[PDB]
Amino acid sequence: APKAVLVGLPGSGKSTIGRRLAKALGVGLLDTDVAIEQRTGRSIADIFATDGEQEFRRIEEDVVRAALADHDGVLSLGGGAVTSPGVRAALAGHTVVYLEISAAEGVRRTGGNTVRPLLAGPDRAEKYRALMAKRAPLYRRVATMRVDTNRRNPGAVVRHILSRLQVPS
Template sequence: MKEKSFEPGCDNVVLIGMPGAGKSTLGIVLAKILCRDFVDADLLIQQSCDKSLQRLIDTLGPDAFIEIENQVLSEMSFEHSVIATGGSAVYSDAAMEHLGKIGRVVYLKISFDELKARLADFSDRGVVMKGGIGMSLRDLYDERLPLYEKYADITVDVNDLSITAAARKVAAALK
């Protein structure tokens, strides 16, 4: 694990990874295992803008959405929580730097084949495609993989695991 300093009192677990990796679903189970609160960043963004993620992306475009996401993530001040980020959180250096200061960043790693199986249709999931509509799922995976690896304090392979088994694996990796 990378050596870094945290802000005082900040013992959060921040989940990053591809859409469909299980950040939100696994995050709820992990929060129960660790006796922590659960925060879904995508829901915070939707609540702050009063629109679904997909509608925000369609209306504003990927770059403006990333700015909104950056602002919401950079202003988070939770403690003792499991925070599920959106898959595009890693596009914002400022947000990831802030999240890295308030908690341990855990990358939920899945293979491309697993991603394909989980995300057969991602057209209405609120997935940010920086390369535009013509961007393939493979392009998205290849673009984001190095960013997840860059920001992760801990990487946990969750391929072929149930949500509960994956959450237990993450909890064990945090010890």
């Protein structure tokens, strides 16, 4: 089972923190989005476009539950995985790190040409605030440690992480 599970919105640092936290703890990183593409042979975008979000969430839930059982390092969950009650259920008892980010920073950090079915222009900032508003309680419900990525250098938020895992609370 994973040493840590990372949850948060797109732009919250899951891939980069994942990377730094993993190096720090000395294990591998798995991203569930990558795992979905591997198992299905399909792009995330294609699944949403052709089969739709609900089918994506079912696939995602199965991949996440498997990953929680089978992987021993750091696991990063796609930003919408916590909307699935079965995912929240499976997270019970794990160490779960919520990477908190404000809308402005999150919006800035997601503004490239990455394909994002749920965060595509125009009015991306409105869409991001909507996701935040809906998902905030769900991240909070599952998380065992929260870290602020808004201002801190990454390598730092991670110190908060490696240090935190280690001592009581």
